[PDB]
Amino acid sequence: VWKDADTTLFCASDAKAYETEVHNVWATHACVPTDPNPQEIHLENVTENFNMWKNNMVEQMHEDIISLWDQSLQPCVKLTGGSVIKQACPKISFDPIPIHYCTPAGYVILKCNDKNFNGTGPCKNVSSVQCTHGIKPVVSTQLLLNGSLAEEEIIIRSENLTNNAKTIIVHLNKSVEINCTRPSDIRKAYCEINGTKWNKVLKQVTEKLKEHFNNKTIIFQPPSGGDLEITMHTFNCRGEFFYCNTTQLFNNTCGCNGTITLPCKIKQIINMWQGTGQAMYAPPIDGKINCVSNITGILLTRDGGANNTSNETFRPGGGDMRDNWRSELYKYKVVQI
């Protein structure tokens, strides 16, 4: 009694209308207040098919996050091509907030509750919703932060495991904490990670990929070329862009179960993930910067040519932030009634 049809969604959130936080301020006038009585109703004995890769819900989320960042973050010198802008860049307050996506009249969001759903194929436990759930728009590379965990075992999401061009999204079932600090060289910082927890999870991820890869041996080597943005766990902490060398995490060696410390730097000059170009920001806040986050997902790529070798090699990746969003909109699909 329905049909697949992509249209314009709208958004909702608990954005505090008094907070100056840029996500709050932008959500105070680009989104409607939250659904007071959310009503998730189940669809008895139904089966509909999902494809988290050919989902237009991301393409819409992408545009919003682009708008949020374009309105909010103030660079001292925005640059493009055949143009150079030189505005101001004061001290802000950054901290993502959950925003809910919603469907207008005549349409509805279908949700996939199969716990072991890989993102693609038929879904047996389908329930409809008027809006999604709170989704923090967190921008990052290699690791996915402050995300939603799985409800069973690790999941391997890829549009096509056969193609090495396609990225691999590893959905963890156990969040691993990351703790990054710049104490009172002002651009030097470090991230602390529990080696024990991590190596175990990584060992779990190893066997999970063996299953999908004919028991071949796997190796986690570091990135193979690219910009500093892509070869470093790039993210944002309280406004300041952090660049973290994850070489310790991606090794096949792991007395290596204490506290893994990763060296980081706060960069003022970055390569925008919108593609636009490069941008420069002010020094950091006069004090002690600190963010504690949950490692939820992992973003990997695989090298080709190994159809006659024994083992398989994966490197942490990213770049396209659509995968960051698609890591949250995988279970949703928009249908018109």
Ligand X SMILES: *[C@@H]1O[C@H](CO)[C@@H](O)[C@H](O)[C@H]1NC(C)=O
Ligand Y SMILES: CS(=O)(=O)N1CCC[C@H](C(=O)Nc2ccc(Cl)c(F)c2)C1
Q: Which residue stretch of 68-76, 224-232, 247-255, 289-297 sits at the interface with ligand Y (rule: CB under 6 A)?
A: 224-232
Q: What CA dihedral angle connects 75, 20, 99 and 320, to 10 degrees?
A: 10
310-320: burial string, b at 16+ Cβ within 10 Å, e else: eebbbbbbbbe
Contact code string over 148-177 relative to ligand X, x by CB under 6 A: -----xx-x-x-xxxx---------xxx--
Regarding 281 and contact with ligand Y (CB under 6 A), the answer is: no
| Close Cβ partners of 43 (under 8 Å, ≥ 6 residues apart) | 110, 126, 127, 128
Regarding 95 and contact with ligand Y (CB under 6 A), the answer is: no
The answer to whether the CB of 113 falls within 8 A of the CB of 127 is yes
Q: How far is the CB of 104 from ligand X (least distance, A)?
A: 25
Please pick, from the candidates 106, 258, 275, 305, the single residue that binds ligand Y as defined by CB under 6 A.
275
By C-alpha distance, which of 47, 40, 52, 51 is closest to 128?
A: 40
Residues listed for the chain: 337
Please pick, from the candidates 40, 59, 151, 227, the single residue that binds ligand Y as defined by CB under 6 A.
227
How far is the C-alpha of 23 from the C-alpha of 64, rounded, in Å?
11
Please pick, from the candidates 121, 277, 283, 287, the single residue that binds ligand X as defined by CB under 6 A.
121
| Close Cβ partners of 63 (under 8 Å, ≥ 6 residues apart) | none
Please pick, from the candidates 103, 128, 140, 142, the single residue that binds ligand Y as defined by CB under 6 A.
140
Regarding 146 and contact with ligand X (CB under 6 A), the answer is: yes
Per CB under 6 A, which of residues 251..270 are in contact with ligand Y?
270
Q: How far is the CB of 91 from ligand Y (least distance, A)?
A: 18
Q: How many residues touch ligand Y (CB under 6 A)?
A: 17
Positions in the binding site for ligand Y (CB under 6 A): 139-141, 227, 229-230, 234-236, 241, 270-273, 275, 319-320
